[PDB]
Every structure is written in structure tokens, then in C-alpha cells.
């Protein structure tokens, strides 16, 4: 039940080139965006290490966020030692979120997204366990790692990161390649 949660009338990019440019306005410190008002960083919503969500805001500019959403649980006193695991189903990146009082995180204008990935890390999975990969990368504003994770569901219908966000969606609906 995976696809590219995309604003419908952004249909046309590779969605590794699009989360790059997610990236772009994330590095610009100087970065504003009018419609961003609250502006929340993040830091998880239903606990306070482990729990459900994983919200994030670009350290640089504090608008351009991600929010991240499973099955989470932080290894502090666990293993691998302060580490994340756990599952991983949907990515959201947007320019500014908000809520974060009574309501989880969201952004203020909702760009592309993601969902359906059903990724799950073993315990041990430290950092090397996919789900602690892709979000501190989206952190850091990398996409390298979430294109490979991507990978598994494109993989199985036979494309990628670089799939269009109609193709993603489509192959991801039924699959529309032939």
C-alpha cells in the first residue's frame, strides 16, 4: 500500500529529484516562507524518545521540516545505545510545521509525502537499521538514504528512486508499466 503523497500537481518528478530540492530550500539558512507562521522543530509526538511520530525542522533555516511517522523506539538504555528502531510507513516533507500542543505535527504547506513503505528495524538495527538512516538524513537534508529505502517497494515492480511521482503512484496503485 505504498505511494508518493505528492500535493496532486506535483506528478512529474523523479522523487529522488524532488526531495533534492526539498533539500536545497533546506540547507538556505535564509530561507523564509510566508506561510509558515508556528513553525514547529519536532521532537517526536506520542513519547518522549519512542513512541509514534518523528517530526524534524532544518536546524539552518527552521522551516523546511520533515515529519516522520511508525513505530519507533530510541535505544538509550536498549543495545545498541542510543540508538532509533523500530517501524517506518510514512515520510512527509513540507515547509514548516506545526501544531505540536494537542495536535501531532504538520506541515503548514504540505508537500510531497510518503507512506505505505512498511519498514520495520530489528532491535540491533542501530545505526545501520534503515529507519535511523533515513531520518537522520532527512535531518541532515539527505535523501540518499530514504531513495534506497524507497528502493523496496519501487524494486518489487521494478523501478526506483528516480520513478516519477505518476509512475511511483501508479505502479504503486497497480502498477501501469506495461
Known sequence: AFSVNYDSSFGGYSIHDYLGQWASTFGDVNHTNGNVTDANSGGFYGGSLSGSQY?????????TAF?????????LFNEPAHTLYGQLDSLSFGDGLSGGDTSPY?????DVSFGGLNLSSLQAQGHDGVVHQVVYGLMSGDTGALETALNGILDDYGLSVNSTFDQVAAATA?????
Open 55 to 63: 517530526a524534524i525542522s532544518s536546524t539552518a533555516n527552521q522551516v
Open 67 to 75: 515529519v516522520a511517522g511508525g513505530n519507533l523506539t530510541y535505544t
Open 106 to 110: 504538520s506541515i503548514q504547506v504540505p
Open 174 to 178: 497497480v502498477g501501469v508499466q506495461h
